[PDB]
Structures are given as C-alpha cells and as structure tokens.
Design a protein around this ligand. Sequence first.
Ligand SMILES: Nc1ncnc2c1ncn2[C@@H]1O[C@H](COP(=O)(O)OP(=O)(O)NP(=O)(O)O)[C@@H](O)[C@H]1O
Ligand SMILES: Nc1ncnc2c1ncn2[C@@H]1O[C@H](COP(=O)(O)OP(=O)(O)NP(=O)(O)O)[C@@H](O)[C@H]1O
Ligand SMILES: Nc1ncnc2c1ncn2[C@@H]1O[C@H](COP(=O)(O)OP(=O)(O)O)[C@@H](O)[C@H]1O
Lengths: 742, 490
Amino acid sequence: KQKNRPNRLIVDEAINEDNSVVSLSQPKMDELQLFRGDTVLLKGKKRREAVCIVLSDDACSDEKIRMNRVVRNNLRVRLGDVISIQPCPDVKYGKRIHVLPIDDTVEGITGNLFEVYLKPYFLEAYRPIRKGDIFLVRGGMRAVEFKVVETDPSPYCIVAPDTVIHCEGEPIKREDEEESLNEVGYDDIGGCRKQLAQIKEMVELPLRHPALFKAIGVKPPRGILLYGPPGTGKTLIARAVANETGAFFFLINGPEIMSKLAGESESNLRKAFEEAEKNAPAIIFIDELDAIAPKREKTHGEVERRIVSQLLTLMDGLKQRAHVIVMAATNRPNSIDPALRRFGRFDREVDIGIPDATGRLEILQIHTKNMKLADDVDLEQVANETHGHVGADLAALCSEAALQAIRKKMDLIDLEDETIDAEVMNSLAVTMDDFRWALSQSNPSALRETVVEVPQVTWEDIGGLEDVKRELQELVQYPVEHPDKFLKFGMTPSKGVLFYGPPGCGKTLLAKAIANECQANFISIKGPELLTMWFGESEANVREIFDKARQAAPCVLFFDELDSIAKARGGNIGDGGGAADRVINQILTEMDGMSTKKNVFIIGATNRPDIIDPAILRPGRLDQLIYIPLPDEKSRVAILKANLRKSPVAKDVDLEFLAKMTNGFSGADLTEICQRACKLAIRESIESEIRRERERQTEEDDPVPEIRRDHFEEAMRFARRSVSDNDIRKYEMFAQTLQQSR
Amino acid sequence: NGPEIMSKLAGESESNLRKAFEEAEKNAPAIIFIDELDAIAPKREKTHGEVERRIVSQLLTLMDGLKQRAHVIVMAATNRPNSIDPALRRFGRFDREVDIGIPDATGRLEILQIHTKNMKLADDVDLEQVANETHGHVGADLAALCSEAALQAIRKKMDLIDLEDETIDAEVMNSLAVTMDDFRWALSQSNPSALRETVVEVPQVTWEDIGGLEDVKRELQELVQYPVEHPDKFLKFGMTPSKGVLFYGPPGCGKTLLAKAIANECQANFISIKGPELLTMWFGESEANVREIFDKARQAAPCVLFFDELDSIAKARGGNIGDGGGAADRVINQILTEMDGMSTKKNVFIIGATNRPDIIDPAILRPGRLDQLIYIPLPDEKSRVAILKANLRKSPVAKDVDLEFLAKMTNGFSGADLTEICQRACKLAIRESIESEIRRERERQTEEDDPVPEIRRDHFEEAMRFARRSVSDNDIRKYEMFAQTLQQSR
Ligand SMILES: Nc1ncnc2c1ncn2[C@@H]1O[C@H](COP(=O)(O)OP(=O)(O)NP(=O)(O)O)[C@@H](O)[C@H]1O
Ligand SMILES: Nc1ncnc2c1ncn2[C@@H]1O[C@H](COP(=O)(O)OP(=O)(O)NP(=O)(O)O)[C@@H](O)[C@H]1O
Ligand SMILES: Nc1ncnc2c1ncn2[C@@H]1O[C@H](COP(=O)(O)OP(=O)(O)O)[C@@H](O)[C@H]1O
C-alpha cells in the first residue's frame, strides 16, 4: 500500500479562524486529487479522526498543513507531528443531532443556549461533524464549548438547513484527557513574530525529542533571559511555549520567595528544582529575577546574599541534565547580578520590545475577539492613534470600551423594567464613540523610550534625487547580498556615509526610505539627545545605543544634527578649545570597535560641514561624503506633486507655473505653502457652515470641497525664502575645495 | 568553589573550609583549587557584613599554616588582579601570577579543531576562514558556535525528513555531515562576541608591505635588535642603550606599519593605544589607568608599546595658540612618571608618533625617555612604484597597465592617498561586473563568457580623474623648518 508520499503532512499554525477549514498548498491538492470544498478525513494520534472542508493557499510548503487549534486539539496531535489525510466522499446530510455543554464553561449563563449560540453558528454554512468532537462558539463576551453526543447518519455527517437539533439535557463533565481551550497558545499572542520564531527554534529539540540527547554528546542551550518594559506579556509567552510543547511548567516568583523566613525560602527554592527535575521534560520560570538577584552592592543585608548564592549553585548543578530548561524575565539586562549572565547560567537573551502599528492592530483584534462590535468601528484608526501603548494598555482600552457600553445604555435603561441575561447581552453592541471616549481620556501611555521598527516612508515620497538614490543603492544593498565579488577582489566595503547640504532639503527622508527598501530596522538619534548627554556629562549612554543596534541587526543607525555640540560651544570662532568633544569621541571609540560583518549601516547628517571634527572622515568611519543640493524646476514639480497627492485639489491649478516662480526655494518651504492653503480652505469651510447654521436656524450645496486657484494665490503672497546666496556660495566653496585637505 | 561555600550557615561554611584542607593534606601530593576567589574574598570595604570577614581571616590562617608542608599546592582563579583582598597577594600566600588571556587567530583555529574532532564535516568547510572572522571570541564562544552548527544540521535536515518514515540511530547520524552554510548561519547571527578589551599578540604585517624606507628600516634594526642579543659590547664600553623613539612627519606616510613590522620581525608582542583612549582618560579625568597599561606591557615581556596620536590632547585644548595654560597636561605627565620608573633591562621598547612635532611637551625629549627622533618624509617616484606594487599585489590586475607612468604622474602624493586609488578602481570594477551579471540574468531569463575578471586601464583612468592631494606645500615647508632648525633648542 502507498502511504508515505501521497498521504503524509506536518502540522503547523493557521491563518484562518474557521473551525472546519483546513488550508494546504495547490501542488499537494492536485497530487491528492482533491478539489476545493471537498470534505477530507484526517487521522492522528490515538486512532482519532476528523472531517473537515479543505481550502487552498500559497504561503505554504509542499508538506505542511495548516489547521486551527480546535481541530488540532481534536486529534490529540501537537505542532510538528504527522497525520494522515484521505478523501471521504460518502458523507450525508443529518436528520437528528444532540449536543451538550461543558459545565466548566457555562457559569452564570442564564436563559436558553440554543437560540443565542447554536442558531447563528449553523446558519447558511454547511459544516461537517463527527460524533464525539468538541467545538467552540464565541459571543456575549464569553466563549462557550459544545460536545456532540449523537448523529443520525452515525458516526459523521454534514449539517444541512433541515437538520433538527435536540439541545436537551444537562451539562457534561470535562474528563482528564482533553485540555481546556481557555488556556494560552501561540494564537493568543499579538505581534512579536521574530522573537517567537527564535524561542520556538531554541527549545524545539530538547522538549520534543528528549531521547535524542542520549545518543549524541551535544549540549543544548539551557539559559534563556527575556527582557522588555513591564506590560509586554512575558509570562504569557512562557505559558504559551510550555503548553504547545506539552512540557511541564513550574512557576517561581520573586516577592513570594522574599516574603518568607530564611530557612523556608531556601527550602522552597530547593524543592522547586527537585520537583521540576523529577517530571521530565520541564520548564522552570523565574519572573522578577531583578528582585531576588539584584546587583551585589544593592544587597545591603546578609540573607539576600545567601539566596543569590543558593540560586547560583542550583543553576550550576544543571549543566549535566539536559531535560530541564530555565527561563527568566527582567526589565533591562543591566539590572541583575553580573555573575548570572555567563556561560552555563543565562547565555541566551531575547528582547520583546514595544509593538509596531501592525502588531497593535493584531493585539486589538485579539482582545475584541468575542465582543460584537458595530459596523462603523474601524480598528485601523485606533491602531494608528495609540503610539506608545503596550499590550496591557490595549487590553485595558478594550475593557474600558466594553464597560462604558454596558454602563451608558442597557443597564440603567432596563433597571426599571427587568433583569439582565445572555440574550440582551449578545444583542449589545459597542460603537466607535465609546472607543473615542476611552482613547481620549484615562489612558496614560507608559512609554518615553526609544522605538525601533521598519519605517513607512518610501521612494515615492521624495521628488528628485536620482543620482543620490542610485549611489545609496550601490552603497547599502550590494555587499549584503553578493559577497562573491568582494572576496574575489579582496576589497572590503565601507560602513558609513555623511550627508551634507543646505537645511531643509530632505536628508531624513533618504535615510528612512533606504531603511524601508531593504526592510531593515531604523533607529534615529536627534540633536537634543546628544545635547542631553553633553550637558548632563554622561556620555556612558552611547554604549547602550550601539548595543540595541547590534541586537536588532540588520539595522540603520541615523545621527542627524551632528554639528549640534560643535555649535553649542560657540560658532566657528568657538571657545578657546579645539574641535574634540566628549560624545563624538565616544562615537568614534564605539564605532571603530565593532564587527566587520554585522550588517549595521551608520549614517550622519550635518548642514555645517566645516566645523565638524575631521577625525571622523578617516577610513573605517564615515568616509563617503554625499552632497544634497537645492532643487531645480524639474524636481520642484515632483516635490509639489508628492506633497499634494494626499489632499483633494482641483484641476484648474497649473503646477508648472508655481514651480518656475519659486527659484532657490528649499523643499521644506514648498511644503508649508500647501499647509497654508489648506488652513485657508478649512477657515472658509467652517465660516460658510456657521453662516448656514446661523442664517435660517436662528440644502446640501457644498461651498467648496477642495482647494482652488485663489487659495493658492492668497497663500503664495506669504512666500518666504529660507537660505541666502552667501550660504550657497559657502557650500560651493566647500564643494570646489573638497580636495587638498585630509 | 565560592557560591557553594557562601550559601551555607556560618559554622557549616567554616567547617567545610577546614575539612577541605585536612582531607586534601592527608592524601599526598595534592592540589587544591579555589575558583571564584573574588566572591569569597573581596576587598575589605566591600565586606559590609561580619561573617564574611571571619571567612576571609579563616582563609588567611589556613593559607599561612601551609608554609611548612611542601606537598600541597593551592591554585585559584579570578578575573583581574585588583578585584581581591590585597592581603592575599603577598609572599607565602599567592606569589605566582599567570594571565591566560584571549586567543589569537592560530589559537582560534586550534580550538575549532579541538571541538569538531568527531563531527564529520564536509569537504567545502574551510576552518581558516572561520578562524579569521571570529575576532573577539573566547573558547566558550567557539564551543557554542560548533554546537549551534551541529544542532542546525540535525534540525534543518534528517529529523523532519525521517519523522514521517522511521526512527533515528547511529548509522544515520554517522552519515550526517555539516556544511559551510550552517557555519555561516551560526557565525552571522546569535553570536555576541563578549570582548571590548585590549588585545596583545604578534602582528601579521611584515617588511614586504612597506614600499621604500630603507635607511629608516636599517636604523630601526640597530635601535631594537642589537642590545637584546649582544650585551657584550654594551658592558665592555659601559654605555647603556636607549629605550624610546619618536617618529614624525606628514600624516598618512606609514608610521604604524613600521611599528607593526619591527614587532613582527623580533617576534615580540605588540600593544597599541590610539588617540581616543587618551582622550577618554582626559575628558573622564581618570589618568589612573596609565598604571594598568604599563603593567600589561611588563607581564607580557618582550613587547612593543606604541603610542600614536600623541598630540591629540595638545590639539584638543586649542591649536598652537591653545588656552591660557602651558604645555603640561595630566595624562602625558602620568606617562613620564610611569616611564621613568621602570626596569633598565626588561626588554620593553616604547615608540611614539606625532605629525605636529612642535606642540608636544619638550620634557619628553630628555634622556631616559623618547630621545631618538626619526623623520618619515613624503615618498619619491622610486618609492611610489614600490608602494603601488605592494598595494596591488593582493588583487588581480591586468598586464597592459604601466605603473611607472602612474607613479611619476602623482608628485607630492602621500602613501595613504595612493591606497585609495586602488580601492576606487576595484569599486568601479565590482559595479561593472554586477551590472553585466544582472544584464545577462534579465536579458533572456525574463554561456560562461566572463565580462572582465580583473582591472584594466580604463578603470584606472576613471578613478585617476578623482585624484586628490592631502598635504599642502606650506605644511612641507613647516616640517622642513623644524628639520633644518633641529639644532639649538633643547
Ligand atoms: N526633496 C524632497 N521631497 C519631498 N519632500 C521633501 C523634500 N525636501 C524636503 N521635503 C519635506 O521637508 C520636510 C522637512 O525636511 P527634512 O526631511 O526634515 O530635511 P532636514 O533638513 O533633514 N530636517 P530640517 O533641517 O530640520 O528641516 C519633510 O518632512 C518633507 O515633507
Ligand atoms: N610607505 C608605505 N608603504 C605601504 N603602504 C603605505 C605606506 N604609507 C602609507 N601606506 C598605507 O597607508 C595606510 C594608512 O597609513 P598609516 O600607516 O596609518 O600612517 P599614519 O599616518 O600613521 N595613520 P594616519 O595618520 O591616520 O593616516 C596604511 O594602512 C597603508 O596601507
Ligand atoms: N503581545 C500580547 N499579546 C496578547 N496579550 C498581551 C500582549 N501583551 C500584553 N498582553 C496582555 O496584558 C497582560 C500583560 O502580561 P503580564 O501582565 O506581563 O503577564 P501576567 O499578568 O499574565 O503574568 C496580559 O494579561 C495579556 O493578556
């Protein structure tokens, strides 16, 4: 019999949320001789079966199958296991079903469960079922499970519209074999994909195949340290990993240990390891490690040092045993004992970090999973206006929105008539106004720290700068792809670039655009940060900056306003000193001593190129000078089009005339003409609306919906240059005399 | 070990520390090893408690009672000598000190060979590449690197491939090989090199990389290699040799190369202290770290201590006009102090280098200090040919190019500027090659005829139209006034 090649696949994560759709790739589907929508039969561990409608996708391999968590848990398999697939063309429509609830799930549910939950689920969707499964329905701010007990064309069928359901009986007990579905899994973690990938590949072999480490002498990693700001969900990630691998999970925590007597604390710390060890494979989680093992000089007492030393010897005695893994959580790497971050104790480090806007949209979708929002609610808006929020903030935001909806209406309205139950709660919807109320007030964003992400600016927002774009392509994207020519010719690529030119000519845009192109992370350090390090006399924080750059590779490190400190202590005349300062010296030091191939590109920008320290233009540092000049008419047209593409402007306006009229204008000045025109338009519109509201009321004829020629004329009479002729001639002397200095 | 002792009760800790010595003693000969000595015996004021001082004193009397017995040896391990109790580093307790240190590239190749001893690597794996690209790794890093490579090979293939068919055993594991791609994957990511400290080793630059400088080479031979071999004439004539030299000249003329080359010739270790280190000591107001520098020089003898950019601090506080002060600074004073008071025979040679020879403190040119001035001048055509050949010897260049014409065309060029012409030519060549490859890939695919495998005359012409001088005439005349007026100052 042939079973290995046509009938074997490997389980992985899902993208769809339906509990019956199983997704696979088109080559396997025309290899299995299966079309879309055909019910398929899956066999897994412990002779369990399931019937599921099939679907095709493209973002898969040719041996991976994507199934949801319900269907996966219904076969007793876990991720990375193998199953058997078959075509089942002999399913028929049912004529009698009987379903029961699980008593652990139904608590405080009053009314009847049929018409609120089982009526919209099997509505206009032919769903297949098999006797003895468990499915899940979401709604009324709860998630209720249901178990099938019988089927009339036994033991499996399809739910047709004329299939009666006898929802008769009392709740049934959850046995000791299946696991609950209110637990944590990888699906309940929004954002943070790369770090999840790292941790999953780091604990795959020791926890899935434990016997393999009795057949080879190879030491797997045993110390993992997660860090990030509080409220980023680290214990979540721990329980998730521990549940998806089926491993045992023990939990130790700081305050509970440090609130006991001496002997009891040591005895608990010892018993945790002993117990943990006995059951295998296991995971031990120590959250708030900073509390129990701080810096040495911060342990002013005596018993604290005993606890730290006890933890040290306990960690050091697991170098032989390969089935136990220890994970811990902190807030920053430099807040714990330095003798812990060594080989054998905590050698792997992961940084969770703050979510990006797409991650924020993911978290908002996670927490409103069974809330029954209205139709006007646009979560993209909310995800774009919560800059500085972590997962706990978004959870609290959704909860506050829900509580405002329950409070405002439907509780005082019915308090004088009847009681509350599930049917009036399921009909309750939340509106966008509640989200705006919760988003306006009572929400202190808890972030004043740096952000690292892939930016949103792209090449289509920059008018002109073609040669600069080409040279940026050459400097950034070649050695990260094709090392062949660089080894063949033996020459090493550069790792720095210095932009210069008149101010307000689009130097930050180029940096953001080239970071977005290569899909590499972006870090920006403005002028005030360097000046804060200068005044405060604490240049030991440059060491932190580069560290983040290193741990988030590939990356782009952008230093704008590099002439800030050189201008602070006098202009070109300066003080009695020279050109050497503290912070730029630390930059030179930290820049010279880094990896020759780590894929970290450093960009500088300055509009006063002469008063900069010439010791940074030496090789091995920023040594590729690029000149960003003032635009020309062919480029001014492109700048104006790029600025105006976002707002509705009429067709009678001619851009070419406005472009040729502004000679010597810097690109940062053509962008405020647009702002002034829009302010005039908004003023005119509000004035006309108020005139209509006050004319009769003390017929939809839009006064003007866009900008016209007269608004541009009024705004253009306020046109202002921003760079003089002498400044251009100074830049041009620097350009002509670019030779015969160094 | 430290933590196991410091995690007990008082009486139990003392009793274990005593029992260790008694039992150890009985069996003879023995060795007692105390790792993490820094933990159990830190500095006195860092023992804020009471029982810690009792433990340190107990260790002191236990060490002091083995002065009679000659069969027991005590070894200990720390991280730095100035992190433990000063009363331990005395005669009778811990009088011999060894520094292990960071491995060199040949040592790194040795460690990589140790740990892949039974791994069955493939044929394309070139460990020399890996040993040349892991600058900043210690033995544990290399062990982890090899283990990660092995685990990647076991994970990627041969585990998911056979999970749907059979089990794993020894015969399928011996047929498993690791490829160079796994080593590149492990070497790219997940490997934070844990080193930001100084390196000491014998360099790789030799005399065959320096074009010209014959008389300077001869005088360097005389100054460095004679007294370390033949003390006979120096005792017979009673005159003592010098121990310092000061290079000077225009910038970018190969002063670091000479230092590295003479260190490689005599097979002595090399230590380099750039400008930014001195400037961090100046701004940070912590010139107590010069004392550490010389210590390493002493413990790694024979050696060469090279101070480049010695005029950094003198230029930081104004130029020749400077501030209201004079020519004395903090760090250079510490250098004078630490340099005067060292052994007359330890074989440690100190080299200085500066391209602004006038604004330096004249108190360093006195005897017993750097008092052998050497002048590194701008090259000439016969030397420019050698510089160009030395730079181009590593890359494939065609035969139609004539170096003598390019050499005579560049007059007054400093050697650090002829080395970027080569870089520019190679960048143009690499751009041309990538462009032609992309043209072939996009021409038909939307027959091995190499477009150009080397550099030709046209690339050199295009790069040469960007030729830039870097030193003016007035600067040469300033150096020449200093050279002519080298007499009648000191
Ligand atoms: N060539 C250009 N194309 C498109 N927009 C431009 C261009 N030049 C300037 N801008 C606009 O000018 C704004 C400010 O310019 P910016 O990119 O900050 O240059 P900058 O000099 O580095 N910053 P600053 O010196 O403080 O003005 C940007 O937000 C753009 O909207
Ligand atoms: N005579 C020479 N022979 C060979 N290479 C040379 C010579 N002179 C300069 N170079 C090259 O110039 C480069 C930089 O010169 P370098 O030896 O650093 O002189 P330097 O003045 O001490 N350093 P710097 O002042 O920052 O340029 C070296 O890496 C060599 O490749
Ligand atoms: N990335 C995320 N995905 C899903 N939920 C998150 C995320 N980040 C934070 N949260 C939510 O906010 C809380 C933050 O986690 P935390 O308070 O650190 O863990 P716990 O209290 O479970 O130990 C959790 O209750 C979690 O529901």
